[model samples]
Target: SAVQQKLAALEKSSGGRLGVALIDTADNTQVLYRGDERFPMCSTSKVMAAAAVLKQSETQKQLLNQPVEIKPADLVNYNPIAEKHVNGTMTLAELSAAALQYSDNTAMNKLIAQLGGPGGVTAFARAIGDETFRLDRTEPTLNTAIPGDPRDTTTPRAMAQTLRQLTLGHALGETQRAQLVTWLKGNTTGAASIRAGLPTSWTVGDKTGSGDYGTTNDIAVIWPQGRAPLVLVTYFTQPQQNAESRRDVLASAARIIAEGL
Candidate 1:
């Protein structure tokens, strides 16, 4: 397939530090490049964090509209509204929306805490039956002195599998899946990757993550009418490179692959 040829070209051009995986959600035609090596999920882990929330809600039979109060402390350094108000609050849904839409680190950390902490999120990932999806606290340390190692990571195959589960209505029930999709539909981060390659009118749900080093990752579900959905995972890691350069490489690679597709 042209996807395979483009991926090969990308790998060769990147000198093998980039990994790409695209799955034809209909028939599972896959194109992969170093898709097995586990890389830090970065903010991309927030998707899993969101999944954990939905899964827990499913187990508890809670409504998506259920309101959970967000305190001032929860908003500290994370909530823009709270940071500005210093005395305001929002609902769980609002906090999650902010986290996903804006990639608000503080909001995400708060949501992770609300979803029952990293342990709970990890348990949710396991219950979803993904072997390669595991949470490590390496980012908390490297990104901040958050008292623990931020060793969080995920593989391309595992990420694709998670998306498949969501699209197949397995991670959460149908209603919950729809709700999650609606939330993902608003994701605005990592716009230069998979999202940048697709048409403006095409609806895509994707999450992007970047780290202190030149590490970038984006996992997305592209829904084009009259065609089977596609799952695209793009990851780039260049420890000493510039961020803009890395993003350019990822965007260029994604454009190449999507054009071929």
Candidate 2:
């Protein structure tokens, strides 16, 4: 199978374990490789946090314009976008948008709190039938500092299912899900991942995450012209790889699927 060949080459060139899942939006049929193994989600877990936020907001009757403060404790060393805007106030909606679109660690931490901790992310995902999507720690912390412990893990299948539900409005009501997807669509962080694999007629709503080692992942719903959208997820959990190389592996995987479909 070409999928198998691409998967082998991608994992080999990346020097990391790869988890891939592609689904036809028309009928939910899928092609998966190592799609069930727990793999560190990296920052791609932000999608779950975003879903938790919108659902909570809709349930609590909270408006997005309500000011949400960025406290000193929220400082995360790896995030530049939130660091520049510290002590400033943005709405709950704004915080979630920053977290999603920029992969801002600080914004994600605060949103995690709003979700009642890391467990909130897991709780909601599982509640929606995403059994393997896990949230185990706060940001600035990577991979549970243990080899293959699967900290904050999400299998390619689990994430692809979650993306499908989000696209179909499960954890959140319809309107808020659309808003969340909009935030993801504006994401500029993973330009080399799924976005690089897309045609001008196609667009992806996505989130990107990275590990302290050589892990990089992208999960998204890819829209191509008049066709039903597809869910594409690529996860790499390996050690000692250049960032660009990891991204290239993911892009190659996505490009193969997109072009094939």
Candidate 3:
């Protein structure tokens, strides 16, 4: 297949440091590249956090529309003041959107805290069958104040599994699942990676993660209506490399893999 050949060429070209996985969401068939190992999740953890929120909301029948004020204290790590919002308010839905759409560190961290602290999020991951996903137990603080622990980790298989569950309606109820997918569709943070490779007209829902080191990861569900949906998870770690180079590698790999699809 062209996708397989493209992936082979990409791996050879990159000297084999990258990890990639593409699953036919319709049937769980997999095409992979060094995908068994676990890697630091970075901001990608926010996806797990969001899943936790949706699951809990579904169970409690809680609406995400109640407006809540953003207190000064909530801004500690996020520096909400710095963002020129001294007294801003948003519903849980807005917060989730902010977290996914802008990759707002503070917004995600806050949502994680609301979903039951870090431990709660981990428990949620386990409940959804993502045993390999781990959240740091230290208390939840602002993203800026506590650059997330490098120990927070996940595997490509686990990430693919999580997204599959989301799409299959196992993580949350249909309504909540739809809501979550909508938010994911709006994700614009990791455009240089898997998203960069797909056609402009394709509909995809994805989340991206990056850190101080050249760590980049993107998890996505591409909806090609008449065809089976494609689920992709790609991770790159090159602490010594520049961010631009890392992004370029991710984009190239995604392009190659998407061509195969």
Candidate 4:
């Protein structure tokens, strides 16, 4: 309750609407503010891509190690790692790393294809008990955050709940969960968001996304020493597409969550 008031003030000053969720998994403590509203997912779909790959690998023993070829046509915007290796072959492990750790667009498209398509990732989300989570398109195109469009969008509560399952719950087996957690922790893209809010002593694994309409997001599983890990999601959007994306808004939201906890 107290946290919600602080979050409201933060959102007001941010010049954008924010959807936030903070879940203390051990005791099920929750703080949700507009958490049910949808916001464009952008590259955050890479989280589903990475986790779905790991889930499939549980049954497809050779999946992760198998090599796959890449092409120039496969590359999309934000494809830092994939562009460097165009025309070369990469294992699923390598591609998944590019997707999760670096948010490589082409790598995410490749992994999504392995799962059959965007629908496949949505199916994976449903199987993991997240009915509100959905993926309707691939990268670059998916980042076109048109106002009021629900495609490729998710609520903060749904994303955080799904992350909690994959990273801290039993959505994936032990080995798969460990791999996903490691990749999330190694993410290079979230420093200005949730990572900026946390102290150095706390361990955090997060995924960050950005799009038009001032949409920006960060979802994380935070490990506070001597206490249960907390799962937090902060999704931001504005009425005007030209509005600037402020990473500090996400950072402040996370800081509020941490302080309230």
Structural similarity to truth (TM-score) of each candidate: 0.84, 0.93, 0.84, 0.98
* Local distance difference test values of all predictions, in order: 0.68, 0.80, 0.71, 0.90
Candidate ranking under lDDT, highest first, comes to: 4, 2, 3, 1
By summed lDDT, the worst window of 10 consecutive residues in model 1 runs over 141-150
Q: Can you write out model 3's per-residue Cα lDDT over 113-144, one digit (the tens) per residue?
A: 78767888889889878888888742132111
* Model 1 agreement with the true structure over 132-193: per-residue lDDT tens digits: 77665522432321212336766788788787787654778887788778877888666777
Residue-by-residue lDDT tens digits, candidate 2, 141-189: 7444245676788789888888888875466798888898788889989
Off by over 4 Å in 2: 143-145, 241-245
Q: Give the TM-score of candidate 3.
A: 0.84
- What's the alpha carbon RMSD for model 3? 3.7
Q: What does candidate 4 score in Cα RMSD to the true structure?
A: 1.0
Q: What lDDT score is found at residue 143 in candidate 4?
A: 85
- List where candidate 3 sits over 4 angstroms from the true fold: 1-16, 76-85, 137-150, 241-245
lDDT of 3 at 88: 75
Give the alpha carbon lDDT tens digit for every residue of 13-129 in model 4: 877899998899778988899989998988788999889999999999888998888998897778888888889988999999999888888999999899999999999999989
lDDT, candidate 1, equals 0.68
Candidate closest to the true structure, highest lDDT: 4
Candidate 2 accuracy as TM-score: 0.93
